[PDB]
Amino acid sequence: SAPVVGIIMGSQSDWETMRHADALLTELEIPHETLIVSAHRTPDRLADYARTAAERGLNVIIAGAGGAAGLPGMCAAWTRLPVLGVPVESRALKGMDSLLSIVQMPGGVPVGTLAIGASGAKNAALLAASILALYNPALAARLETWRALQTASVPNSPI
Amino acid sequence: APVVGIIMGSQSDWETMRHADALLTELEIPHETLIVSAHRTPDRLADYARTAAERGLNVIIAGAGGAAGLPGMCAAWTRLPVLGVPVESRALKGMDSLLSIVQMPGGVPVGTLAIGASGAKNAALLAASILALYNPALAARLETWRALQTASVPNSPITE
Amino acid sequence: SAPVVGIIMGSQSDWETMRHADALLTELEIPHETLIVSAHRTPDRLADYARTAAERGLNVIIAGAGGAAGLPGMCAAWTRLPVLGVPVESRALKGMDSLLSIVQMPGGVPVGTLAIGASGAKNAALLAASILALYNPALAARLETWRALQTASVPNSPI
Amino acid sequence: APVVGIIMGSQSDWETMRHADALLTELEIPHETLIVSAHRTPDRLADYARTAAERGLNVIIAGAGGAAGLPGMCAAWTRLPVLGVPVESRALKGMDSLLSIVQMPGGVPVGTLAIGASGAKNAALLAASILALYNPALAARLETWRALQTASVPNSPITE
Amino acid sequence: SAPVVGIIMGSQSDWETMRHADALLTELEIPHETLIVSAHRTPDRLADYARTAAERGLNVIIAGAGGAAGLPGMCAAWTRLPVLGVPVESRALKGMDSLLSIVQMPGGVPVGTLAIGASGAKNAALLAASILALYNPALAARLETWRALQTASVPNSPI
Amino acid sequence: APVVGIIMGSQSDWETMRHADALLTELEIPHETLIVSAHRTPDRLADYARTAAERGLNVIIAGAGGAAGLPGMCAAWTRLPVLGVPVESRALKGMDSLLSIVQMPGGVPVGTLAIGASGAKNAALLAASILALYNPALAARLETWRALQTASVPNSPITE
Amino acid sequence: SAPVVGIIMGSQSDWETMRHADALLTELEIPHETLIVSAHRTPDRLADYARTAAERGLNVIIAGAGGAAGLPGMCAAWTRLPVLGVPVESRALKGMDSLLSIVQMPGGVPVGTLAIGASGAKNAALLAASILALYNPALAARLETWRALQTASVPNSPI
Amino acid sequence: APVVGIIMGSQSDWETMRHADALLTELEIPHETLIVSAHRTPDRLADYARTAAERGLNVIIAGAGGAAGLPGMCAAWTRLPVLGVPVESRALKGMDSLLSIVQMPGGVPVGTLAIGASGAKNAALLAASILALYNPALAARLETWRALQTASVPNSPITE
Numbered sequence A, C, E, G: 001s002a003p004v005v006g007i008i009m010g011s012q013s014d015w016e017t018m019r020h021a022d023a024l025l026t027e028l029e030i031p032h033e034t035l036i037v038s039a040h041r042t043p044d045r046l047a048d049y050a051r052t053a054a055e056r057g058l059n060v061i062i063a064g065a066g067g068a069a070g071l072p073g074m075c076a077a078w079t080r081l082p083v084l085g086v087p088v089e090s091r092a093l094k095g096m097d098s099l100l101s102i103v104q105m106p107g108g109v110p111v112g113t114l115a116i117g118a119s120g121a122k123n124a125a126l127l128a129a130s131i132l133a134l135y136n137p138a139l140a141a142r143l144e145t146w147r148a149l150q151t152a153s154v155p156n157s158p159i
Numbered sequence B, D, F, H: 001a002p003v004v005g006i007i008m009g010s011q012s013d014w015e016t017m018r019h020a021d022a023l024l025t026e027l028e029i030p031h032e033t034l035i036v037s038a039h040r041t042p043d044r045l046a047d048y049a050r051t052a053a054e055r056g057l058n059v060i061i062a063g064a065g066g067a068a069g070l071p072g073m074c075a076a077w078t079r080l081p082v083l084g085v086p087v088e089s090r091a092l093k094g095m096d097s098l099l100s101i102v103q104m105p106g107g108v109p110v111g112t113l114a115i116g117a118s119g120a121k122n123a124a125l126l127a128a129s130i131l132a133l134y135n136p137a138l139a140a141r142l143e144t145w146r147a148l149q150t151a152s153v154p155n156s157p158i159t160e
Helices: A012-027 A043-052 A071-078 A096-103 A118-135 A137-153 B011-026 B042-051 B070-077 B095-102 B117-134 B136-151 C012-027 C043-052 C071-078 C096-103 C118-135 C137-153 D011-026 D042-051 D070-077 D095-102 D117-134 D136-151 E012-027 E043-052 E071-078 E096-103 E118-135 E137-153 F011-026 F042-051 F070-077 F095-102 F117-134 F136-151 G012-027 G043-052 G071-078 G096-103 G118-135 G137-153 H011-026 H042-051 H070-077 H095-102 H117-134 H136-151
Strands: A005-009 A032-036 A060-066 A083-088 B004-008 B031-035 B059-064 B082-086 C005-009 C032-036 C060-066 C083-088 D004-008 D031-035 D059-064 D082-086 E005-009 E032-036 E060-066 E083-088 F004-008 F031-035 F059-064 F082-086 G005-009 G032-036 G060-066 G083-088 H004-008 H031-035 H059-064 H082-086
Touching: A005 A012, A005 A043, A005 A071, A005 A118, A012 A032, A012 A060, A012 A083, A012 A118, A043 A071, A043 D042, A043 D070, A060 A071, A060 A096, A060 A118, A071 A083, A071 A096, A071 D042, A083 A096, A083 A118, A096 B095, A096 D095, A118 A137, A118 B117, B004 B011, B004 B070, B004 B117, B011 B031, B011 B059, B011 B082, B011 B117, B042 B070, B042 C043, B042 C071, B059 B070, B059 B095, B059 B117, B070 B082, B070 B095, B070 C043, B082 B095, B082 B117, B095 C096, B117 B136, C005 C012, C005 C043, C005 C071, C005 C118, C012 C032, C012 C060, C012 C083, C012 C118, C043 C071, C060 C071, C060 C096, C060 C118, C071 C083, C071 C096, C083 C096, C083 C118, C096 F095, C118 C137, C118 F117, D004 D011, D004 D070, D004 D117, D011 D031, D011 D059, D011 D082, D011 D117, D042 D070, D059 D070, D059 D095, D059 D117, D070 D082, D070 D095, D082 D095, D082 D117, D095 E096, D117 D136, D117 E118, E005 E012, E005 E043, E005 E071, E005 E118, E012 E032, E012 E060, E012 E083, E012 E118, E043 E071, E043 H042, E043 H070, E060 E071, E060 E096, E060 E118, E071 E083, E071 E096, E071 H042, E083 E096, E083 E118, E096 H095, E118 E137, F004 F011, F004 F070, F004 F117, F011 F031, F011 F059, F011 F082, F011 F117, F042 F070, F042 G043, F042 G071, F059 F070, F059 F095, F059 F117, F070 F082, F070 F095, F070 G043, F082 F095, F082 F117, F095 G096, F117 F136, G005 G012, G005 G043, G005 G071, G005 G118, G012 G032, G012 G060, G012 G083, G012 G118, G043 G071, G060 G071, G060 G096, G060 G118, G071 G083, G071 G096, G083 G096, G083 G118, G096 H095, G118 G137, G118 H117, H004 H011, H004 H070, H004 H117, H011 H031, H011 H059, H011 H082, H011 H117, H042 H070, H059 H070, H059 H095, H059 H117, H070 H082, H070 H095, H082 H095, H082 H117, H117 H136
Parallel strands: A005 A032, A005 A060, A060 A083, B004 B031, B004 B059, B059 B082, C005 C032, C005 C060, C060 C083, D004 D031, D004 D059, D059 D082, E005 E032, E005 E060, E060 E083, F004 F031, F004 F059, F059 F082, G005 G032, G005 G060, G060 G083, H004 H031, H004 H059, H059 H082
Antiparallel strands: none
């Protein structure tokens, strides 16, 4: 019932991308919360969210943002929990700025980065699932089924 | 018994991956370090990745330069979380390494870290934070490590 | 009758691009098979496909994929046959990620890479044709005709 | 009392940021130079940026390499103008630094300068031009400095 | 009444982007002028504009241009006033050329550069506002209110 | 009699192309190595490419740096498969070389390999795999070479 | 009457871009020819065109192509005349491949390169005009008028 | 009397621009070489570019690194053809130089050459080919130079 994964994003504009992470966690029945937390516009909200995440029972945080995406990095700065970052595609630079702003974290504060866009949001949720599966047998079985179905469902020839 | 597996495409990757090895040892996390080439020893990778979970591994840290493809293929065969470290390449300075690792299609994740030594160290720290979720002793050591890092940052530069 | 060229792609989404390779081989009457084989979602299917390709009579493999396109490289890892790679255009990075993930193969396992997109798929088929033409006189003549017609058909002035 | 604050993520950034320090001193602009890590000392940054205005600072010059994120987060907490200096990185030569600093979302500005030493010097000059708007003495010194720069450019290269 | 901020752009095509800077200054009630001044097509107009800016009472200049955007740099070359540059998104290179042509100013002549596009235009105006606020108490209070409202208005969850 | 032609724009390309030469010799594949400049000796290239097939060549390996354009123009004149090797350039590290070679328009193919030495070696290996399709003896030597490469990969890095 | 400028392009697809060079030369009343000459598909046609250009009275050649654009460089390889290159925007890489393939000519064989796209085609024609103006007084006056009108026509404020 | 003007932003550009100077002298083309900074000496540039035609110059070769903007602004003030040479920059290896020079808006052309020494040499050769259009003696010298370049290309690399 209590969320074990927190999905946060810099703004409503990131939802089109982050909704894919939400859908995947729901699919695997992983309790989670989905919120908007801006490192740049609501820094104190982020500070509070990140430093109290562990105490609240969260195990993994999935953070998405575009452009000079400082959200994932700053979230990781305040929590000891694993932080996964999703580079949201930006209008001009197609997420290259988002990607470098998230993945190039200096040594000492990590952010596990996924692909730019929807695929990355989906994979952040799957990566979070694989993490939780390490100590949740039931979920591990559901993840195995998910991966197995993915593999078995790939067509043999194009239509 | 190892709970983290550090794999790389060749000896040339060790200069970078040794930083992940050192950090895990520092946090007292048992691990194994191997060379597994996705392109030169594809069957070795298949076997390694396929059996990782049953062998007791919880996290795999894979390093690759250029288009080596090691992290992605490891993730294709294991249900375990796979972290990728882009090893700096001669011509493209790791940009090819980075894109070839992070741009995984939806369905097969690879948590990617920064290009080079920083990425290797952070891959180990990320692995540590994952393991700490269910290992109180490690969680305490990680907390101490993170707190020390914060307390050790100087307040002013040596402007001499 | 038996296929001598195998066209494989990571997913149905790659078909819009790889269909150009299919059309060209058919045009030159080169027997081939067209399949979906995902290195990431169906690794064992790829292992089987690539290691048995030569035994099955295939002479050249054309592999297309986008993003962190590991398909061409892994196919080349399991077969001694020439592997040609087609970088499929990706949404965000326009195939630059596809290109680097295919062309930057470390020494020891080659992948002959073509241009990003439809042009690359067409050229992979033409390159495969030029390879087969080295030991198939009839096909060599048809390829000569194809190249000759291409050259002769270029307009002298724009419309 | 300092009117400009120069902050950077680590001692490694000093090689670049010292150029901003030198220029401010040259123009007789009182300032402070500190190391504040957005990722390693987030609360130190929060406090620094939040209290900058009340402490008398008018402009903040922040340097960062890679994805350090220092300039952006400083700007998030202060109403003061924040100038960012992309510090050259090993692999991507400051391109990651540049994009991570300049591409701020609408609503939270960071005036960004060139990658490296030139950017640090220009950040100080930009800060100087801002302060000169309400400091006649400084305005005169800046005018003299700009005029001297122009008058000092050689007319021909030493072609020997 | 007299303008204290000058917004200049290379051409009418830049207006779609620079209008965001105009709107923000008006919102904060900052007197300003908005003009088209091309460094490449009207060099003498730029020379006159920039060298006389200070005398006319301007305190900050916001310059926007795309491609080989020389406007911001040349404006800064002629004035002692702070010059802020806005990289306008270009058709082919998505503003990467605009960005490098503005931000990479050699030491000695600065241009405070903002993000590519509309966000950059808005932020140039906000940065100009933060500069003027240093010596204008009333404006400083309005800027505080603007920043406070921005922070308070961020939703807590996506729709 | 040569069955593979290795051509390059200048002596400066040899440092890279020599790797293709060495690999072909290792696999006992007769070949010729020449300097042919698309831009400085356009007619030499026209003649070389036009007559390659009648001279007995089966595959051409062309190396070029920057915008040299050698691989593409060779392919324009020959019906033979042409493989391109991007030679690393000083400023753009071979990125200009790579794009100028791989982005051929539909209708005129150039099978492109990696930037630098790895690409040169792989161009030779690719040429070898093409020739092996109709040369049993070579096919056996290639099989042995590939198998040896796989068997020679170390299982663990020298972590000393 | 006889053409003094030759505009050549790799294919009909380049016309949308190169037509801007054609329009400008016509505007300035500069006799010219506009043809399709493909370095890759019609190499011999290019060889003949370029080596005989000077003999035919051409003074400047404007060559446009996209992707691995070898047309400008190869044209310059066969003629002593000044060759100006126009990078045509490519689908995937937005002309970055076109640009590098044209501008990065090794020392010894130059190609004066213009901007990617329509602007580049227009400027190639203007650059050709400025070259011809050096020894054609009447044209020099028309070019002066063209440049003067361009400068005088720039609006002072956006609409 | 000079017919070509070679201008650059600073002494640091000379290492690159000297190649244009040498080539013009080789072809016996009278020219002048000056340092003119678009950003540091804007009025010097205005005067230089504005009066170039009346002073007898037929072509201007301008070199710039980063965002110096010299070629574009020179072209803004002169009706003469302006050729631009991107000088290699420290961090971005001339990519910033290249884009800042070649991406001129329609209406104000700058014929751009390759990044670095090759571009400087080619700018001089391009200027030479322009002048040769109305100078028979020079046309003959250029023809001889181009023919010699072609005849001097070696047929095979020194494979020792």
